[PDB]
Subunit: 29 residues, 3 copies
Amino acid sequence: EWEALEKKCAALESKLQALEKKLEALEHG
Amino acid sequence: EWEALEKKCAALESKLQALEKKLEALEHG
Amino acid sequence: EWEALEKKCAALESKLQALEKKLEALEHG
Ligand SMILES: [As]
Ligand SMILES: [Zn+2]
Ligand SMILES: [Zn+2]
Ligand SMILES: [Zn+2]
Ligand SMILES: [Zn+2]
């Protein structure tokens, strides 16, 4: 159960970095 | 404490989902 | 361990708030 949450937040960190990069692209057209 | 962090992480997941939705609508719509 | 995960999830919340504001910027030009 603790391990599951840790993996979850790590997945979220991954997804978030992906979104940040995608938004940087879209910002620039 | 456990409940609080689990709820926070889950909210973050929902929010990330909502933002990627909005990003897709901006990019394509 | 617990404190580091709380710190991480907090940093993720901050980053997601920044990204929401940025997406809203782009929705408006
Ligand atoms: As988290
Ligand atoms: Zn930039
Ligand atoms: Zn630029
Ligand atoms: Zn808006
Ligand atoms: Zn507006």
